[PDB]
């Protein structure tokens, strides 16, 4: 199961 | 823009035995960018309906793909993989050799 947070560069 | 040329291997799923059904694979790896065109050939002509894996990549970020189709080897039929990539000025043809 995946990491769920959206993280922008 | 960096570019890395593909390594190309064309081979069967099992050691070939004339007249027995098998799978013909063309594995392209080590390349960047990811845009690549791969055909499998039978007597020089493109095989239809070849399938391929979903794009993935290695520890060093270089891409790999597997293209594959069912085939029944014979003594006379020639098979090959034809690859185009930005690093190649012309398509590269690697012939299937049952000993590799």
């Amino acid at each position: 199961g995946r990491f769920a947070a959206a993280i922008a560069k | 823009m960096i570019q890395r040329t593909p390594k190309i291997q064309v081979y069967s799923r099992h050691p070939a035995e004339n007249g027995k059904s098998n799978f013909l694979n063309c594995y392209v790896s080590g390349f960047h960018p990811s845009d690549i065109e791969v055909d499998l050939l039978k007597n020089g002509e493109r095989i239809e309906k070849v399938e391929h894996s979903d794009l993935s990549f290695s520890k060093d970020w270089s891409f790999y793909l597997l293209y594959y189709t069912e085939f029944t080897p014979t003594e006379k039929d020639e098979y090959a993989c034809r690859v185009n990539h930005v690093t190649l000025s012309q398509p590269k043809i690697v012939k299937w050799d049952r000993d590799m």
Partner: protein
């Protein structure tokens, strides 16, 4: 045994040809288990191994939401990176991400990863500490500053030490028939005359899983590394892998050459010679 769970992601821009294509795949060890492609007719996380099929609708909905959201974040990131590198809107560019966890027998985290590449080059990587970053260049340092401000490393650490390893443990159990089976290599040596003066000896390893293997040739007990053609390990298409190693052997030397094979499915390393 020791095991890993890794997720791979690639976005590739195609200016004037719609939005960047996003492809992500997940693996346990060398087994693909999920895929998502934004060019699919109805993009969804899809199963690729039998042992993940039992996950229920909530799993697939959640995972699909995560994937769709990552496709969108990647598209924003590709626009940002054009700025960071002072690039035009005209070219195709690539954004890659790999993350996941390695565990030993007891399932505790041994190493975590979360790293990114732009145009095939390292960009930013979470260090082994799971608390600090390695930025490749001054562009990536701008991302580092943002991620330090937002305490992103802490979020990753919590996932990599917790959920990542717990999912891997579940998958290993559900997939114990396959994920916890090593298939040893089937090995043989072939001989291929080149000229009157020499022939190739080729040492084959076929039908093995996982992919990790060592295959070498010695002559009179000395490693032949510089003189060995060693092909990249390659997928057979039936879960298994293949590899070979070849040497050019002068006439009459064949029995001086030995092929050596190590693989997790072999309780002891093998030694083989050409058998005429």
């Amino acid at each position: 045994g020791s095991h890993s769970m890794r997720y791979f992601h690639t976005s590739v821009s195609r200016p004037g040809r719609g939005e960047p294509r996003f492809i992500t795949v997940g693996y346990v060890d060398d087994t693909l288990f999920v895929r998502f492609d934004s060019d699919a007719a109805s993009p969804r996380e899809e199963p690729r191994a039998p042992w993940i099929e039992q996950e229920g609708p909530e799993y697939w909905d959640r995972e699909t939401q995560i994937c769709k959201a990552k496709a969108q974040t990647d598209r924003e990131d590709l626009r940002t990176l054009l700025r960071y590198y002072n690039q035009s809107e005209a070219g195709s560019h690539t954004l890659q991400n790999m993350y996941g966890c390695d565990v030993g027998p007891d399932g505790r985290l041994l190493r975590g990863y979360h790293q990114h590449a732009y145009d095939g080059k390292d960009y930013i990587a979470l260090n082994e500490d799971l608390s600090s970053w390695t930025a490749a260049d001054t562009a990536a340092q701008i991302t580092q500053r943002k991620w330090e401000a937002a305490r992103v490393a802490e979020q990753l650490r919590a996932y990599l030490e917790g959920e990542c390893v717990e999912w891997l443990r579940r998958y290993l159990e559900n997939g114990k028939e396959t994920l916890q089976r090593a298939d040893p290599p089937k090995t043989h040596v072939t001989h291929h005359p080149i000229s009157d003066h020499e022939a190739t000896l080729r040492c084959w390893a076929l039908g093995f899983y996982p992919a990790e293997i060592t295959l070498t040739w010695q002559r009179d007990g000395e490693d032949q590394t510089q003189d060995t053609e060693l092909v990249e390990t390659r997928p057979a298409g039936d879960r298994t892998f293949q590899k070979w190693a070849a040497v050019v052997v002068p006439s009459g030397e064949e029995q001086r050459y030995t092929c050596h094979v190590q693989h997790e499915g072999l309780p002891k390393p093998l030694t083989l010679r050409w058998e005429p």
